[PDB]
Amino acid sequence: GSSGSSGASLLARYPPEKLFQAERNFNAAQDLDVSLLEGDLVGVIKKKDPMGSQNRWLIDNGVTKGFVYSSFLKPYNPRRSHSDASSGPSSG
């Protein structure tokens, strides 16, 4: 839920050294892949895969876990005023 927030949360959720944005509109190719948005941001999770390839890394689209090629991703840079966080209380 809430894509924007997530994307903004990704900054807090994940570190800057693992903050990568979508270069272009990624189209899920495999079952391990997941549709993304060139405007959507992701946070590198694993720089490997259950096969043996550094080309495909595991990222989180603030929704699920998908596999994409760093090529499609880009090394973000929240440096210079570019960070935001948020929280959520509990209820009954």
From Swiss-Prot:
Expression sites (tissue/organ): Detected in heart, brain, lung, liver, skeletal muscle, kidney and pancreas.
Subcellular location: Cytoplasm; Golgi apparatus, Golgi stack; Cytoplasm, Cytoskeleton; Synapse
Residue ranges of every copy of the SH3 domain listed in the record: 15-78
Subunit structure as annotated in this protein's UniProt entry: Binds DNM1 via its N-terminal SH3 domains. The C-terminal SH3 domain binds a complex containing actin, tubulin, Hsp70 and actin-regulatory proteins, such as ENAH, EVL, WIRE, CR16, WAVE1 and NAP1L1. Interacts with FASLG. Interacts (via SH3 domain 6) with WASL. Interacts (via SH3 domain 6) interacts with ENAH. Interacts (via C-terminal domain) with TJP1; required for the apical cell-cell junction localization of DNMBP. (Microbial infection) Interacts (via SH3 domain 6) with L.monocytogenes InlC.
Disease: Cataract 48: A form of cataract, an opacification of the crystalline lens of the eye that frequently results in visual impairment or blindness. Opacities vary in morphology, are often confined to a portion of the lens, and may be static or progressive. In general, the more posteriorly located and dense an opacity, the greater the impact on visual function. CTRCT48 is an autosomal recessive form characterized by infantile or early-childhood onset.
Its biological purpose: Plays a critical role as a guanine nucleotide exchange factor (GEF) for CDC42 in several intracellular processes associated with the actin and microtubule cytoskeleton. Regulates the structure of apical junctions through F-actin organization in epithelial cells. Participates in the normal lumenogenesis of epithelial cell cysts by regulating spindle orientation. Plays a role in ciliogenesis. May play a role in membrane trafficking between the cell surface and the Golgi.
Protein name: Dynamin-binding protein
Residues included from the entire protein: 1278 to 1355 of 1577
